[PDB]
Amino acid sequence: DTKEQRILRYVQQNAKPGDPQSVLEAIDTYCTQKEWAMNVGDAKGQIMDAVIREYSPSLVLELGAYCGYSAVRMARLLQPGARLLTMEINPDCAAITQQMLNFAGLQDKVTILNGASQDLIPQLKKKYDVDTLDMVFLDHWKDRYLPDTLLLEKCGLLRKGTVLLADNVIVPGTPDFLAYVRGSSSFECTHYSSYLEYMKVVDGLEKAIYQGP
Ligand SMILES: O=C(NC/C=C/[C@H]1O[C@@H](n2cnc(C(F)(F)F)c2)[C@H](O)[C@@H]1O)c1cc([N+](=O)[O-])cc(O)c1O
Ligand SMILES: [Mg+2]
Numbered sequence: 353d354t355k356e357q358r359i360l361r362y363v364q365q366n367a368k369p370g371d372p373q374s375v376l377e378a379i380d381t382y383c384t385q386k387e388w389a390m391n392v393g394d395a396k397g398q399i400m401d402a403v404i405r406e407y408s409p410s411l412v413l414e415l416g417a418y419c420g421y422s423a424v425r426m427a428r429l430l431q432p433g434a435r436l437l438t439m440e441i442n443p444d445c446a447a448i449t450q451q452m453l454n455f456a457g458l459q460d461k462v463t464i465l466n467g468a469s470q471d472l473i474p475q476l477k478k479k480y481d482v483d484t485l486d487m488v489f490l491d492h493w494k495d496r497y498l499p500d501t502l503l504l505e506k507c508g509l510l511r512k513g514t515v516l517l518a519d520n521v522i523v524p525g526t527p528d529f530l531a532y533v534r535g536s537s538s539f540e541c542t543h544y545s546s547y548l549e550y551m552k553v554v555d556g557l558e559k560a561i562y563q564g565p
Contacts, residue, residue: 355387356448359419362386363455370457372428379421383550391421392491392519393549400489400517403544404429407515409486413476414438415469415500416492418445420452426489427458436462437480439472439492469496473503484511490529491519497529523548 359382367378376397383389392400404412404426410433417423417440427436440446446466453459463480465472469492476482488504490497497518504510521530521543533539 354444355389356419356445358387359383359389360448360451363452367455369455372424372456372458375424375452375456376421379419380550384552388550388553390418391549392425393547396519396546396549397422397425399544399546400425401429403515403517404487407487408434409515410434411482411485412436412487412489413485413504413509414489414491415496416440416490417449417464418491420449422489422491423449423453423462424456424458427453427461428456430461434461437465437476437482438462439465439467439469441466441468441492469500469503473500473509474507476507476509482509485509485514487515487517489517489519490526494520494524494526495528497526498532501529501533520548 359379362382363375363378366381368374376394379391380394383391383393400422408431410431412426412430412435414423414426414436417438423436423438430436438449440449443466446464450459450464453462465480485504490500492500501516516533516539518526518529520526534541
C-alpha cells in the first residue's frame with residue numbers, strides 16, 4: 353500500500369464522481385492534513401488556471417502526471433475538443449492518474465503516455481496526431497526540464513507562441529532550465545511568485561520529567 357494509492361482511495365471515498373473540483377479539493381485536504389505529496393497544490397494551481405484560461409490551448413502536453421492532480425486541474429478548463437497529453441514514466445503513477453481522471457469524468461479529454469520522454473517525445477506527431485503544441489506544463493524531474501525542452505524544439509513541437517509553464521523553479525529549483533530560458537532570445541519569460549504546496553508542517557516539543565533511578 354503506497355501513499356499514492358492512499359490518495360486515490362481517499363478521493364474515491366470522499367469526492368463526488370464526475371466533479372473535478374471535488375477531486376481537487378479531496379486531494380488537497382488529504383495532503384494538507386494527512387501526508388505531504390508533490391501535487392502543485394491550490395495556490396500555484398490558481399495561477400495555472402488563470403494562465404490556461406488566458407491562452408485557451410487546444411493541445412497541451414504535461415510532463416509529469418504523478419497522481420493526476422494537475423491533469424484534472426488543466427483538463428477541467430479545456431474547451432470542447434481540446435486535448436491534454438500527459439507523460440508519466442512510472443506505470444504505477446500512470447495507472448493512478450488514469451483512475452483519478454476517470455473518477456473526475458475527464459477521461460475523454462486526456463491521453464496518458466507511459467514511457468520515457470526520450471522515446472515518447474519523438475513519437476508524438478506520428479502516434480498521437482500532433483502538429484505543434486499550444487502549451488507545455490513541466491513538472492517532472494527537475495533535471496529533465498531543460499533536456500526535454502531542447503528535445504521538444506528538435507522535434508518541431510514548438511511554434512511561435514507555444515507557452516511553456518514550469519513548476520518548482522524556486523523550490524526545489526530548476527537552475528539550468530531557468531537560466532536557459534531567461535537568457536535565450538527564443539523565449540519571453542514571466543515569473544509568477546507563489547508558495548510551495550502543503551507547507552503547514554507539524555513539529556512538537558517533548559517534555560520528559562525524570563523520576564529517579
Ligand atoms: O521532485 C518533484 N517532482 C518530480 C516529479 C516527478 C514525476 O514525473 C514523472 N515523470 C518523470 N519523467 C517523466 C516523463 F514525462 F518525462 F517521461 C514523467 C515521475 O515518475 C513522477 O511521477 C517535486 C518536488 C517537490 N518538493 O518540494 O520536493 C515539489 C514539487 O512540486 C515537485 O514537483
Ligand atoms: Mg511540482
